[PDB]
Amino acid sequence: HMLSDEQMQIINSLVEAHHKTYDDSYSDFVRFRPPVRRLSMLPHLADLVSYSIQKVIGFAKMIPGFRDLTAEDQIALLKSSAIEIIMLRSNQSFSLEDMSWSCGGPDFKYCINDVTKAGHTLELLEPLVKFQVGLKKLKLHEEEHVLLMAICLLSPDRPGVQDHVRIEALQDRLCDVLQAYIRIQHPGGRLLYAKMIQKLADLRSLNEEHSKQYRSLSFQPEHSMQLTPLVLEVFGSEVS
Amino acid sequence: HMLSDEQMQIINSLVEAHHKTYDDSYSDFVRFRPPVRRLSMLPHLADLVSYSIQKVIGFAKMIPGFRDLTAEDQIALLKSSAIEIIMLRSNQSFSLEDMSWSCGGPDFKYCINDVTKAGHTLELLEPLVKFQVGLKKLKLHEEEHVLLMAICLLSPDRPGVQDHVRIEALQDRLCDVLQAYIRIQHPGGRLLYAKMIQKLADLRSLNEEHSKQYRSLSFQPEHSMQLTPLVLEVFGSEVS
Amino acid sequence: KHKILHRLLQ
Amino acid sequence: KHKILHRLLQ
Ligand SMILES: CC(C)(O)CCC[C@@H](CC#CC(O)(C(F)(F)F)C(F)(F)F)[C@H]1CC[C@H]2/C(=C/C=C3C[C@@H](O)C[C@H](O)C3)CCC[C@]12C
Ligand SMILES: CC(C)(O)CCC[C@@H](CC#CC(O)(C(F)(F)F)C(F)(F)F)[C@H]1CC[C@H]2/C(=C/C=C3C[C@@H](O)C[C@H](O)C3)CCC[C@]12C
């Protein structure tokens, strides 16, 4: 029971990819439309999400085997999983102490209330926080966190995927890497893997609810005009 | 030779409209994506222009007779004239002393160089400055400035206009008001009116060049993604 | 189709 | 048509 010189290369890649597309100082946030605490946080959070999508795309492109999919599959996967990858990667800034995402100073500490100022219900936010708390409680190794993001992105059960035999293959190889990594490198991690797969299940429902909330926003031009072309294109139903 | 109780009501309306849609403190600019001095000013200037378009729409809706046009005509006029109304209204912030638009502090003082950081050529900017200098030299009364904006918007010679017999009527009434106002209220203004009409001619060419520059930008997704949904819709060729 | 413009024009 | 996504995907 020892990782193969191919399983660790996959791990090397995903971890470097994450480092290349995730800044722990959050210094680009000053370039977003500033936060205001009628849907005052919408501009800021739309910018955040748009930016994060760009980052998720950069990451996805570095997932072993992703570049080889058809552009359609790459798109079909990004569109379906974008919000979930975003929810996953945000855990890095999320804080149990204050139950908010802490991206620096008074301005970039996002709490439940801030997101409601962006067209979301206090009600719909409960699960997201709960999910962040459960995910944070797992205390994932960077290897696992980064692996979980890649596995999520390569879910075959996404509307629009064509070659779902091949995405299933890439994801299984990834799942294997993670199971092996946990068994070999993660003491006390006997039941961790399954808790992680459970998280993917939680992501699907969170994705579902968001999609609904987002439709409501995107249908009112006064609100939709606050979005970005990227956000509108990624969360839009335009089908190709 | 004395203005009619109807010509002054038109003047009252356009002047109040301008006051309602133009802030001389420029305090909303802090809500734009901040300026950076690869096309670093694009985000800021796109936000500025998007905001200004919103303001131009607010103004247009208060131009006597504009609300009565078909929604198509209103749109056809806004789309064609938007950039020109913007160029006209900016003269208020433009400064002969420094040949820049001065909207407050180091951050919001826009010079020729800043606009080039937004995908425009130093070459294409020459006329805009020249135009601002000529327009500023006219030292227009607020009544005239505001009148000139309304006349520009109701130009009948715009792609897409349907009822160009009726826009011509509204614009002529406006032109009359301005000619009368100048004759009666503007000492030393014998030759001013014609210089103002000449400015409309200058706007057409400036509109033309911008449209070209804008096409170049809007065709590169990496640049187009920096625009706003409003800008993209107003300067887009989508035809209806 | 001009969703936003039509909206903003009231 | 996904102009931007296709662009960003290199
Ligand atoms: C809770 C839910 C199911 O209802 C969905 C909430 C989704 C979004 C809010 C939104 C939205 C929009 O629908 C958009 F269109 F999608 F935009 C908007 F805005 F309403 F339009 C949530 C998910 C993760 C959250 C956060 C992540 C933090 C990060 C900081 C840092 O860790 C970097 C991470 O990438 C990201 C904090 C803010 C709120 C976020 C971004
Ligand atoms: C010179 C030209 C013919 O090539 C066209 C220049 C047009 C724009 C720049 C642009 C653009 C875009 O093409 C956009 F898409 F259209 F956005 C972008 F950005 F490149 F994409 C010019 C015209 C008036 C100028 C200014 C007005 C100032 C104001 C401040 C204040 O007075 C309020 C006014 O409304 C507005 C200062 C900055 C540069 C402006 C906005």
3-state secondary structure chain B: CCCCCCHHHHHHHHHHHHHHHCCCCCHHHHHCCCCCCCCCCHHHHHHHHHHHHHHHHHHHCCCCCHHHCCHHHHHHHHHHHHHHHHHHHHHHCEECCCCEEECCCCCCEECHHHHHCCCCCHHHHHHHHHHHHHHHHCCCCHHHHHHHHHHHHCCCCCCCCCCHHHHHHHHHHHHHHHHHHHHHHCCCCCCHHHHHHHHHHHHHHHHHHHHHHHHHHHCCHHHHCCCCHHHHHHCCCCCC
The residues, ordered by sequence, that sit 6+ positions from A42 with a Cβ below 8 Å of its Cβ are: A117, A118, A119, A217, A223, A226
Residue A180 beta carbon below 6 angstroms from any ligand 1 atom = no
Q: In what order do the strands lie in the sheet with A109-110?
A: A94-95, A100-102, A109-110
Backbone angles phi, psi at B94, to 5 degrees: -60, 145
Which residue does chain A place closest to C7, by CA atoms?
A221
Place of tokens 């103002």: B196
Q: From CA A81, how far away is CA A56, in angstroms rounded? A: 10
Which residues on adjacent β-strands are paired with residue A109? A102
Q: From CA B234, how far away is CA B214, in angstroms rounded? A: 11
Pocket test for ligand 1, best of A21, A39, A48, A100 (most atoms within 8 A of CB): A48
Facing residue for B78 by CB, picked from C1, C3, C5: C5
Q: From CA B46, how far away is CA A84, in angstroms rounded? A: 30
Q: From CA A228, how far away is CA A1, in angstroms rounded? A: 48
Q: From CA B218, how far away is CA B224, in angstroms rounded? A: 5
Amino acid at position A178, single letter: L
Listed residue (B153, B147, B151) closest to B181, CA to CA: B147
Q: From CA B189, how far away is CA A209, in angstroms rounded? A: 65
Q: Which residue, by CA, sits nearest to atom 17 of ligand 2?
A: B46
Q: From CA B76, how far away is CA B55, in angstroms rounded? A: 17
Cα torsion A110, A126, A113, B44 to 10°: value is 50
Amino acid at position A240, single letter: S
Helix (H) or strand (E) holding A189: none
Cβ-contact A226, A214 below 8 angstroms: no
Q: From CA A232, how far away is CA A49, in angstroms rounded? A: 11
The 8-class DSSP code of residue A105 comes to T
Listed residue (B235, B17, B207) closest to B124, CA to CA: B207
Cβ-contact B178, B144 below 8 angstroms: yes
Q: Could you tell me how many CB contacts below 8 A there are between chain B and chain D?
A: 13
Distances (CA, A) of A210 to A87, A99, A205, A217, D4: 11, 20, 9, 10, 22
Listed residue (B238, B217, B239) closest to B46, CA to CA: B217
By the CB < 8 Å criterion, does B230 face chain A?
yes
Helix (H) or strand (E) holding A101: strand A100-102
Listed residue (A101, A130, A131, A96) closest to A113, CA to CA: A101
Facing residue for B229 by CB, picked from A30, A36, A227: A227
Listed residue (B17, B69, B31, B50) closest to B118, CA to CA: B50
* Per-position b or e across B141-172, b if 16+ CB within 10 A of its CB: bebbbbbbbbbbbbbbebeebeeeebbeebbe
Facing residue for C8 by CB, picked from B54, B79, B240: B54
Nearest atom in ligand 2 to the alpha carbon of residue B128 is 1
Q: From CA B227, how far away is CA A139, in angstroms rounded? A: 40
The 8-class DSSP code of residue A95 comes to E
Cβ-contact B72, B239 below 8 angstroms: no
Q: From CA A209, how far away is CA A201, in angstroms rounded? A: 13
Interface contact B222-D3, CB threshold 8 A: no
Q: From CA B231, how far away is CA B51, in angstroms rounded? A: 9
Which residues on adjacent β-strands are paired with residue A102? A109
Backbone angles phi, psi at A5, to 5 degrees: -65, 0
Which residue does chain B place closest to A41, by CA atoms?
B31
Chains B and D touch (3+ CB pairs under 8 A): yes
Query: At CB < 8 Å, which residues of chain C contact A?
Result: 3-4, 6-8
Q: From CA B23, how far away is CA A179, in angstroms rounded? A: 61
Q: From CA B117, how far away is CA B40, in angstroms rounded? A: 6
- Rounded to 10°, the helix B192-218/B164-185 angle is 130
| Min distance B221 CA to chain D CA atoms (Å) | 5
Cα torsion A187, A188, A191, A193 to 10°: value is -30
Interface contact A33-B30, CB threshold 8 A: no
Q: For residue A5, how many C-alpha atoms fall within 13 Å in the half-sphere facing its CB?
A: 0
Q: How was this structure determined?
A: X-ray
The residues, ordered by sequence, that sit 6+ positions from A121 with a Cβ below 8 Å of its Cβ are: A213
Place of tokens 């979980």: A148
Residue A224 beta carbon below 6 angstroms from any ligand 1 atom = no
Place of tokens 């030299």: B137
Give the number of other Cβ atoms within 10 Å of residue A58's Cβ: 15
Q: From CA A82, how far away is CA A95, in angstroms rounded? A: 22
Amino acid at position A85, single letter: I
Backbone angles phi, psi at B232, to 5 degrees: -60, -35
- Domains of chain A (ranges, CATH numbers): 1-240 (1.10.565.10)
Helix (H) or strand (E) holding A170: helix A164-185
Distances (CA, A) of A14 to A7, A61, A178, B136: 11, 10, 12, 58
Q: From CA A43, how far away is CA A135, in angstroms rounded? A: 27
Q: From CA D10, how far away is CA C10, in angstroms rounded? A: 40
SS3 A125: helix
DSSP codes joined into one string, A34-77: PP----TTHHHHHHHHHHHHHHHHHHHTTSTTGGGS-HHHHHHH
The residues, ordered by sequence, that sit 6+ positions from A146 with a Cβ below 8 Å of its Cβ are: A11, A14, A15, A17, A18
Q: From CA B182, how far away is CA B189, in angstroms rounded? A: 6
Q: From CA A209, how far away is CA A106, in angstroms rounded? A: 29
Resolution in A: 2.4
Place of tokens 């969360």: A235
Backbone angles phi, psi at B25, to 5 degrees: -95, -25
Between β-strands A109-110 and B109-110, what pairing exists: parallel, antiparallel or unpaired? Answer: unpaired
Listed residue (B226, B236, B240, B202) closest to B79, CA to CA: B236
* Distance from chain centroid for Cα A148: 10
Q: Which residue, by CA, sits nearest to atom 15 of ligand 1?
A: A46
